[PDB]
């Protein structure tokens, strides 16, 4: 009640260490153990909360690994002080994890902080708790109890950060670290719940990663398929391996077509490339109304011709906007090459035939929807206008864009890769990619509950929730439980047993 909690802890440490040698020289061994028992009651006995809540969490936040190990000793010797240690420090885990994801204004940085708290608690176990396992039990319990509460802020932020770690830079060439931080991804986000939204978003992420730019490594994606195969269903990693098999099918079609133009001897500059896919293992894509230069339409018909062979049973529903393409660009003061997107490639295709178009037939002769075309003009316009030049300036954009293509263009590099768009995405794009999972759980829980009542006739709702939580990779809301109860009654697999929702039957 005079010194600080760490000061009193060091005093207790040294004063207990005093009482040994008193016996060692002169006092009695058989009263050494009564002496330490009494003294430890006098110092540490009956003070296992006012030392062990604040002065625990205070010196954990200060993270003095010496005194944390000191109190670990000083409360692993004592009568039961490690129980107070486990409870106070585990509540400390829950709250000091909870100081991340419940913050809706602070979603720009969540994943790195989660990694940080994971790292800190791991280090406090491995030295400050000296690889005891009770602490690990409280850790995992506390983490899962925490993240059952917010499922679909983290898994989406986590998916974006997983994709961010799946980028090809010049800074990283040791994928061993990215293997190790990938191991931390798997282990740490096994605490994070709602993995179906992460799963579908990772379909979106491999789409946005292959379709523009290039991935961090081949073995990185292979290791992720093998790792995410674990901890989820074995029919939950059928689509991803289907992605890479469909990519190999498209490459084999590429080899076949290149061999079939080996005797036609292409020397022309105009290229067509379609990597074709099936809708069972990929993100779904529906064509949107867009306008294509008629030679591209000729290439579409060529694509039909080479499409109709090789496992016929095939019928066109083409996409002609989702790729990125390399293009040479005429300007004054040099001819450099652009790596750009099809939304912008059509823009640049019209800025060959003339300079002087306006947003009316830029809206029309592209055909591009408003949501895509605004963000198309947020790249290389709404700033840095030396290729396209848009009459509204700044973040605010009005419907009056007047364009005259610029002769002037300056940069110090070749292969001018100015392409945010397809390695970016919009808010309602994310929201819609979430709703394609929201009322997609419907058939999942439908199948699960029809199988349950086909297995056990009576099951209260507080047990249906637990069987579903056992079975599924995401947490099911109480609203969705009412939703499936009512729809099962609509399709005659439930009857309310005893005229209340307490129990049910499988009678129609």
């Amino acid at each position: 009640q005079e010194r600080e909690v760490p000061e009193y802890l060091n005093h207790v440490s040294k004063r207990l260490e005093e009482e040994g040698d008193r016996v060692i020289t002169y006092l009695d061994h058989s009263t050494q153990k009564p002496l330490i028992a009494c003294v430890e009651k006098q110092l540490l006995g009956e003070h296992l909360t006012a030392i062990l809540q604040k002065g625990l969490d205070h010196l954990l936040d200060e993270n003095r690994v010496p005194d944390l190990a000191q109190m670990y000793q000083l409360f692993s010797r004592v009568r039961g002080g490690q129980q107070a240690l486990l409870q106070h420090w585990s509540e400390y885990i829950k709250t000091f994890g909870t100081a991340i994801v419940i913050n809706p204004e602070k979603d720009k940085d969540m994943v790195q902080d989660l990694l940080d708290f994971k790292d800190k608690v791991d280090h406090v176990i491995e030295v400050c708790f000296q690889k005891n396992e009770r602490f690990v039990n409280l850790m995992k319990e506390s983490f899962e109890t925490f993240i059952n509460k917010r499922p679909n802020k983290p898994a989406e932020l986590i998916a974006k950060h997983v994709d961010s770690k799946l980028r090809a830079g010049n800074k990283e060439a040791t994928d061993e670290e990215l293997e190790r931080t990938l191991d931390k991804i798997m282990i740490l986000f096994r605490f994070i719940h709602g993995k179906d939204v992460f799963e579908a978003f990772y379909k979106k992420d491999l789409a946005k990663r292959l379709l523009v730019g290039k991935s961090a490594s081949v073995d990185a994606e292979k290791s992720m398929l093998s790792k995410l195969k674990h901890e989820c269903g074995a029919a939950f990693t059928s689509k991803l391996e289907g992605m890479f098999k469909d990519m190999e099918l498209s490459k084999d079609i590429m080899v076949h077509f290149k061999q079939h133009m080996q005797n036609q001897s292409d020397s022309g500059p105009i290229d067509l490339t379609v990597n074709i896919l099936t809708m069972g293992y990929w993100p779904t894509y529906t064509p949107m109304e867009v306008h294509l230069t008629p030679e591209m339409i000729k290439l579409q018909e060529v694509f039909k011709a080479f499409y109709l062979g090789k496992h016929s049973g095939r019928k066109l529903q083409w996409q002609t906007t989702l790729g990125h393409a390399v293009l040479k660009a005429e300007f004054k003061e040099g001819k450099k090459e652009f790596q750009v997107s099809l939304f912008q490639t059509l823009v640049l295709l019209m800025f060959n035939e003339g300079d002087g178009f306006s947003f009316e037939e830029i809206k029309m002769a592209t055909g591009i929807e408003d949501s895509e075309l605004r963000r198309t003009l947020q790249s290389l316009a709404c700033g840095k206008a030396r290729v396209l030049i848009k009459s509204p300036k700044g973040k605010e954009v009005e419907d009056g864009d007047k364009f005259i293509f610029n002769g002037e263009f300056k940069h110090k590099l070749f292969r001018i890769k100015i392409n945010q768009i397809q390695m970016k995405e919009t808010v309602e794009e994310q929201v819609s990619t979430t709703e394609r999972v929201f009322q997609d759980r419907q058939y999942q829980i439908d199948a699960a509950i029809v199988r349950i009542m086909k297995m056990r006739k009576t099951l209260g709702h507080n047990l249906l929730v637990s069987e579903l939580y056992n079975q599924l990779k995401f947490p099911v809301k109480p609203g969705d439980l009412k939703k499936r109860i009512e729809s099962l009654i609509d399709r005659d697999y439930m009857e309310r047993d005893k005229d209340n929702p307490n129990q049910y039957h499988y009678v129609a």
Binding site: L210, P269, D271, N275, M279, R314, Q319, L327, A329
Partner: peptide
């Protein structure tokens, strides 16, 4: 020949079903 001379068009797309449900 043009203000962008066409060197590469590349696309990703889906091959679709053709059997009755």
């Amino acid at each position: 020949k043009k203000r962008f001379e066409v060197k590469k068009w590349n696309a990703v797309a889906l091959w679709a079903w053709d059997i009755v449900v």
